[PDB]
Design a protein around this ligand. Structure first.
Ligand SMILES: O=C(O)/C(O)=C/C(=O)c1ccc(O)cc1Cl
Ligand SMILES: [Mg+2]
Ligand SMILES: [Mg+2]
Length: 709
């Protein structure tokens, strides 16, 4: 109740102080009219925000009762019913996107896209610096080069493993920017003569099979420090330094091979951070503002990067950006947050808050620092939207914030998350709702799965979690997303993107698997680390995404029948041990992620599963695990005693795995973290659309209360 009255709102003090003292100075916006704008937008838009939420339960309540009636499929009765209640809306006539004022990294460049918790300062700093990463470092410290005999990693440098790193990179160069004759492995040096690349072999001195891939160099042209290359819009740089220990042994004195990695980075306020009050929102706002003001620094002291100067092939000076073009992921429409209350006591919607405050903050990126978008746009991802009407509401919100922040209309562009069922089967209408704003569509397959499990909770027992990846509804969902994206002129205008790789240390598996996404037409895909972005950049150098896309133009490869194929299981597909392992695995990952969410405030964690695989957990993966067990419990393939035994089995395992920690076992009934995970399961099928923030925020709001009395 240390709150600031502005009209009908009682803004928490620490937030109000942060906006006036750190966010507003430099933007030339009168704080009085800003806060009056906050009060006006909240009062004018909260009614429909709440109205669109009641419409979700109302629709889901009918789909619950309909499933309670006994043929298997019948996509005929299921369809005209879903159109009757307004789930299935008409398909609008074809159209093209009008969104303008967008940067090259969105419209044209195809490459990895990094997502990072905005509450972790060092993470967001390295995520912003991730536009340029070392390939040597990515290959050495990772199992992409396996530790067979000789290539074992250790405290000192291993020349054997280091030699395999160099040999790996040499075929990358030969496979991405080849020579006319010979191979990069036998190159004895590099020079620039008469404005073109000349590489000396032991036989001769070949050039580039296409000289148009010679992007530039540093140092002198007759002995460069570095050679700049370009392939499929992505830049490659060879560092030349015979003085360095790696270059000392390299056949051409090469120290490293630099890759353009995360061309864009998403700053996340949502499923990968735990922010439940005004105090938590401010640290994310402060970090997000430091990234826009350029002065974000971590205690050496780590800072952002200036752009990279170069020499053209002719001799002129040019420059290339050293930072990733930053998005920001607001929170969805669901949750409220006591960062602001009204005179009546109720909490204001958290999504309205983020658009006003992250939007005010993003203005600092538009001007000079001691800089983000140069074409004048603000890039905001809005997740967890349900259908085209919610996209239009999301659009009127941004149109009201621009008016309040003064910016010209359509300044705040939006990347649509394609991760709920009602959006998936109404996607063409959702893109049109943001026809002049949309920046990307992206298949959030994890959240889309949890929504598929919940929307058909009453239908029957569902397939095991590891089986959703091969179910027909999700393979259509991906093609259907690429299709209607391209059919709207996204090619050349906006990104068509795909989802997340969670196995943080299975990068050899990532290299031999996430090539499928650029082959599927996606111009971008999600990586969890600056290192994974570097290793993901290899797939775009082997896949001409602009070629894959124009081959897919005019194709329609997914029917409405295919997208509605519910992933139910056939009777008694499972032995007892197969049932138990699924239960243990789901109970394990929930407990591992929740305990750090509730006890320590971390919204993203590495939790090993039952098979000892390190998994990057967020609220989306948590939505899948809880909803699956809550679905198996609802139709009776497990009992309520099986969950508690499994929860009490997996709890001391997590404790031993976990530092300033705190065990849940043995007196489970006392631990707030243990009780939270129990609630997400046993009350799982009654959380709206399976969302986990109601339980998580409340239990986090409860743990903080104890740790102060
Ligand atoms: O499939 C989705 O719904 C989607 O949006 C993915 C994520 O949000 C995510 C998952 C795991 C992580 O470690 C990080 C993130 Cl960012
Ligand atoms: Mg090529
Ligand atoms: Mg998601």
């Amino acid at each position: 109740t240390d709150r600031v009255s502005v009209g009908n709102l009682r803004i928490a003090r620490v937030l109000y102080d942060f906006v006036n003292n750190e966010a507003l100075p430099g933007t030339d916006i009168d704080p009085d009219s800003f806060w009056a704008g906050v009060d006006k937008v909240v009062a004018d838009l909260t009614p429909q925000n709440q109205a669109l939420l009641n419409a979700r339960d109302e629709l889901q309540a009918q789909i619950d009762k309909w499933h309670r009636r006994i043929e298997p499929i019948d996509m005929d009765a299921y369809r005209q019913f879903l159109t009757e209640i307004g789930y299935l809306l008409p398909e609008p006539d074809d159209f093209t996107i009008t969104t303008s004022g967008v940067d090259a990294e969105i419209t044209t460049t195809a490459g990895p896209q990094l997502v990072v918790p905005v509450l972790n300062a060092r993470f967001a700093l390295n995520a912003a610096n991730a536009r340029w990463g070392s390939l040597y470092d990515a290959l050495y410290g990772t199992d992409v080069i396996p530790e067979t005999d000789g290539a074992e990693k250790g405290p000192t440098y291993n020349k054997v493993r280091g030699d395999k790193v160099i040999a790996y990179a040499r075929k990358f160069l030969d496979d991405s920017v080849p020579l006319s004759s010979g191979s990069f492995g036998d190159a004895t040096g590099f020079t620039v003569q008469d404005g073109q690349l000349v590489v000396a072999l032991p036989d001769k001195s070949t050039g580039l099979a296409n000289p148009g891939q010679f992007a530039g160099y540093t140092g002198a042209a007759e002995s460069p420090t570095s050679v700049l290359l370009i392939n499929h819009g992505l830049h490659i740089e060879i560092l030349i330094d015979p003085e360095s220990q790696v270059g000392t042994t390299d056949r051409a004195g090469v120290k490293d091979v630099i890759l353009e990695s995360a061309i864009t980075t998403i700053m996340d306020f949502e499923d990968s951070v735990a922010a439940v009050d005004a105090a938590d929102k401010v640290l994310g706002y402060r970090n997000w503002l430091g990234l826009n003001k350029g002065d974000l620094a971590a205690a050496f002291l780590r800072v952002l990067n200036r752009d990279r100067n170069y020499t053209a092939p002719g001799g002129g000076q040019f420059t290339l950006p050293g930072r990733s073009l930053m998005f920001v992921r607001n929170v969805g429409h669901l949750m409220t947050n006591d960062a602001i209350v009204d005179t009546d006591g109720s909490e204001v919607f958290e999504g309205i808050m983020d658009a006003l405050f992250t939007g005010l903050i993003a203005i600092h990126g538009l001007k000079a620092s001691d800089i983000n978008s140069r074409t004048g746009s603000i890039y905001i991802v809005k997740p967890k939207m349900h259908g085209p009407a919610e996209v239009a509401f999301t659009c009127e919100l941004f149109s009201r914030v621009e008016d309040v922040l003064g910016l010209p209309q359509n300044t705040m562009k939006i990347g649509i998350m394609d991760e709920e069922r009602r959006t998936t089967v109404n996607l063409k209408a959702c893109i049109k709702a943001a026809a002049d704003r949309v920046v990307f569509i992206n298949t959030g397959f994890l959240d889309r799965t949890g929504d598929e499990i919940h929307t058909s909770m009453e239908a029957g027992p569902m397939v095991r979690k590891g089986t959703m990846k091969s179910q027909p509804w999700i393979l259509a969902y991906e093609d259907h997303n690429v299709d209607a994206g391209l059919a709207a002129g996204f090619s050349g205008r906006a990104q068509v993107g795909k989802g997340m790789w969670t196995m943080t240390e299975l990068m050899a598996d990532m290299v031999e698997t996430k090539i499928a996404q650029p082959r599927a037409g996606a111009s971008t895909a999600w990586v969890p680390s600056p290192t994974a972005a570097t290793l993901h950049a290899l797939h775009y150098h082997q896949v001409d995404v602009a070629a894959v896309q124009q081959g897919l133009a005019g194709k329609r490869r997914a029917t409405i029948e295919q997208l509605l194929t519910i992933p139910l299981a056939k009777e008694l597909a499972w032995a007892p041990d197969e049932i138990r392992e699924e239960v243990d695995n789901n109970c394990q990952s929930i407990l591992g992620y929740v305990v750090r969410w509730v006890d320590q405030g971390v919204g993203c964690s590495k939790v090993p599963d039952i098979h000892d695989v390190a998994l990057m957990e967020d609220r989306a993966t948590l939505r899948i695990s809880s909803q699956l067990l809550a679905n198996w419990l609802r139709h009776g393939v497990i009992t309520s005693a099986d969950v508690r035994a499994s929860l009490e089995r997996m709890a001391p395992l997590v404790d031993r795995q976990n530092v300033a920690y705190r065990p849940m076992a043995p007196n489970f009934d006392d631990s707030i973290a243990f009780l939270a995970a129990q609630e997400l399961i046993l009350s799982g099928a009654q959380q709206p659309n399976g969302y986990t923030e109601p339980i998580l925020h409340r239990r986090r709001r409860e743990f903080k209360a104890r740790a102060a009395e």
